[PDB]
């Protein structure tokens, strides 16, 4: 195995080696004793990191084996174990674990490794404390990333957990299920050093995975560090940031990563976290921060399905409206959004939040007092966005923005119950988003952009974007008439002939659609089939 450092192939052998050390009892222990001695000698090899790991692993196991005292009494702990293990840590035994874990016969590997990971907690705690204390003292109040990372062995361990456990909830549950891991978590919660603290937050996020695990993580902070302390930290940072006008980004990014993970996988609890991080998160968003996008993503997680959207909409409108001066024209409104949502992350976050809020509802006469009211200006903003999208950098990025946009557009189409008409209403008809949505769609890069999604089709994620493109076109055809007659007159800039020539004339889209009926995804095929009917 030594005669491999990078070679991924090493992973194949880890199951055998992890389990082998696990079953040291089998060996004799004349043999085990000999290996132990040989390994201490073997500390000569820094170049082979993976030797260093495996040996360290053996030690983690050996300690347990020495439990039958014939062996243990014989040995002196400081010489026999701690000195060597410490040497291994120094020689990057944790780092390579992290690598094994990060770069994840799965059953054998997962089982054997999780046994490894756990052995380290229970048997090793002396080492953890030794390292933690070592780290706290070492740095002194221009540190380079390399200097920060040198001593970081404890944090690396936390990451080891994060990578290994992630997904896998199964494994993750072990932490939460009984109240030593649970001790481990409590212990980790205690480590105050900003870097340890941030990795602790990240590790827990990984642990939060199941709907079930997420629930425990909720309780962990709430009941037996509290959520309140967390928001407090965010609040404090906010003040420091603004009063002032990397370390913080690490901490904050972690704070958000964690809140996001749980809020997403939760239920009625969501409201509780919502009311509490919502107010604080809103305040943080006002500050520039690199981060803006991230809080928007978290905010979105908080947004509830029901009526009680209102606090969120106000925050958003207020948070676009506040600085901007709006003339009585449209452009000034666009400017408000453009000024605030300066960078790419800001926009993507914004889109996710908006997608969520627009899902099914918002307040009447929104923006009243400050500006011409209503939802319409937000859709105009998208002109800035998906108009632009075509000229992304970075396909992955373009797709990232395009998708939220399609989902929003589709939602707005569903947003009005067309059926009521075919088989203060006026005001309601004015307020719904379906109106501005149709207006923009008719604006022929708008139609084109939607159309190109169809022309160029097929990772799986991209496939979804395609389905949405079709579904939207179908929806438009079905109710194109409704908009022109009923909706447009009420609420009575301009009209239709443009999309048709382009869809109908322009042929490639028609042919592409034809090809789609066959290709399995029923959503794409069934919809493609419907469209041609609508076009004809």
């Amino acid at each position: 195995l030594e005669r491999v450092s990078l070679d991924a192939v090493n992973l194949a052998l880890l199951m055998a080696l992890l389990y082998c050390f696990d079953i040291s009892f089998i060996e004799q222990k004349q043999y085990i004793a000999t290996i132990h001695s040989r390994l201490q000698d073997s500390q000569l090899w820094k170049l082979p990191g993976l030797q260093a790991t495996v040996r360290l692993a053996w030690a983690l196991a050996l300690r347990g084996i020495s439990q039958l005292p014939d062996v243990t009494a014989l040995a002196e702990f400081t010489e026999a174990d701690e000195a060597m293990a410490e040497l291994a840590i120094a020689d990057n035994v944790f780092l390579f674990l992290m690598e094994s874990v990060v770069v994840s016969q799965e059953e054998f590997y997962i089982r054997r490794v999780h046994n490894l990971i756990t052995d380290f907690l229970a048997l090793m705690p002396m080492k953890v404390k030794q390292l933690r204390n070592r780290a706290d003292e070492d740095a002194r109040m221009m540190g380079n990333e390399p200097p920060i990372s040198l001593r970081r062995d404890l944090e690396h361990l936390m990451l080891l957990i994060g990578e290994l456990y992630k997904k896998n909830p199964e494994l993750a549950l072990e932490y939460w299920c009984p109240t030593v891991l649970s001790k481990f978590v409590r212990q980790m919660g205690d480590l105050l050093p900003p870097t340890i603290y941030i990795p602790y937050l990240k590790m827990l996020q990984g642990l939060a995975n199941g709907p079930q695990c997420a629930h425990y993580c909720f309780s962990l902070l709430k009941v037996n560090v509290s959520w309140e302390h967390f928001f407090h930290s965010l609040m404090l940072y906010h003040e420091h940031l603004r009063k002032d006008l990397q370390k913080e980004q690490d901490g904050l990014i972690a704070f958000l990563q964690l809140t996001s993970t749980i809020i997403t996988w939760s239920e009625n609890a969501r409201l509780a976290l919502c009311e509490t991080p919502v107010v604080v998160i809103l305040g943080l968003l006002q500050c520039s921060i690199p981060l803006k996008a991230e809080l928007l993503k978290t905010l979105a997680a908080f947004g509830k399905s029901p009526e009680i959207a209102a606090s969120l909409w106000q925050s958003l409108e207020y948070t676009i409206l506040q600085t901007v001066r709006i003339p009585s024209g449209i452009e000034v409104e666009l400017n408000e959004i453009e000024s605030r949502c300066e960078e790419y992350p800001l926009t993507r976050a914004f889109c996710q939040l908006i997608s969520t809020l627009v899902e099914s509802s918002f307040p009447s006469n929104l923006g009243a007092g400050l500006r011409p009211p209503g939802f319409d200006p937000y859709l105009q903003f998208l002109r800035d966005s998906v108009f632009r999208f075509r000229t992304r950098a970075r396909a992955a990025e373009k797709w990232e923005v395009a998708e939220v946009v399609l989902e929003v557009f589709y939602k707005l189409l569903r947003d009005y119950e067309p059926q009521l008409e075919d088989f203060g209403e006026e005001i309601i008809a004015y307020k719904p988003p379906g109106f501005s949505l149709m207006y923009h769609l008719l604006n022929e890069p708008m139609l084109e952009l939607a159309l190109s999604l169809l022309e160029e089709g097929v990772k799986k994620h991209l496939e979804k974007a395609v389905q949405h493109c079709l579904a939207l076109l179908n929806l438009t055809l079905q109710k194109e008439n409704l908009f022109m007659d009923l909706l447009r007159e009420s609420q009575l800039v301009c009209p239709l002939e443009q999309l048709l020539q382009g869809i109908n004339p322009k042929a490639d889209n028609v042919v592409n659609i034809a090809r789609y009926l066959y290709h399995g995804n029923p959503e794409l095929a069934f919809e493609s089939a419907k469209i041609l009917c609508c076009i004809s």
């Binding site: 204390n133 070592r134 706290d136 003292e137 070492d138 740095a139 002194r140 109040m141």
Partner: protein
């Protein structure tokens, strides 16, 4: 002491280092030895004023690292500065006579502000050294441990904070090599130097060649005792 406190704030002495800062604190320090006087100073809010003055910006706990026991930079505050914090460190030990949470986080807060020193002191006992460095570490070791015992104050009634870890290992390396240490160690005070020349072997107790290293030995030795627990 009220004037002494004011002088501390006043002590920039821009001509070079802050003579007055150290002098005032030392005067307070001598007074601080009296336990009763110590309480008054805290009531006075000496700890409050110590963090607040202009000097606080200067410390290498807040600024850079130029302050060091061996620093060439001298609008002489740089080496004088560790002297003020470090020598005047003893103030906090003495104030502790209060024995209960009242000013413990105040004193502790003081230390909290000077993070750069907490890191530096510990690093300082990396292999480069002065006798003074040993005392500073010894001093901090006492505060944290005591503060920690008090940390076991809980609110095991109330709140506390600070950092223990790197120093112990550093100390051991120094103890083992007396030879390296004597060469390595340098006197910095006129008072320190004669003891360097002088010799107090003792085989009443022997462990060192010189007078100076014995003192050096004594300080780091105690530090190990407290930390070991």
């Amino acid at each position: 002491l009220p004037t002494l406190l004011t002088t501390l704030e006043v002590s920039l002495r821009m001509k070079q280092n802050l003579h007055f800062t150290e002098a005032t604190l030392h005067l307070l320090l001598t007074l601080a030895r009296t336990q009763q006087g110590a309480t008054a100073v805290a009531g006075a809010g000496i700890t409050q004023s110590i963090c607040l003055p202009l000097l606080s910006v200067y410390q290498l706990s807040t600024n850079g690292t130029a302050q060091t026991p061996s620093a060439s930079r001298k609008s002489l505050d740089a080496p004088s500065w560790p002297g003020v914090y470090r020598l005047s460190m003893s103030l906090m030990e003495q104030l502790l006579k209060t024995l209960r949470y009242n000013f413990l986080p105040e004193a502790l807060d003081f230390v909290g502000v000077h993070q750069e020193r907490t890191l530096q002191c510990l690093n300082a006992v990396r292999t480069v050294q002065s006798l003074a460095c040993l005392e500073e570490a010894d001093h901090t070791v006492g505060f944290i441990l005591q503060l920690s015992n008090f940390m076991k104050e809980w609110h095991l009634m109330r709140d506390i904070q600070v950092n223990l870890g790197y120093l112990c290992q550093a100390c051991t390396s120094l103890l083992h090599s007396r030879k390296m240490l004597q060469h390595y160690l340098q006197n910095k005070n006129g008072d320190g130097l004669p003891s360097a020349v002088a010799q107090r072997v003792q085989r009443t107790e022997a462990s060192e060649q010189q007078a100076l290293h014995t003192v050096q030995y004594g300080l780091l030795k105690i530090l190990s005792k407290t930390l070991a627990a």
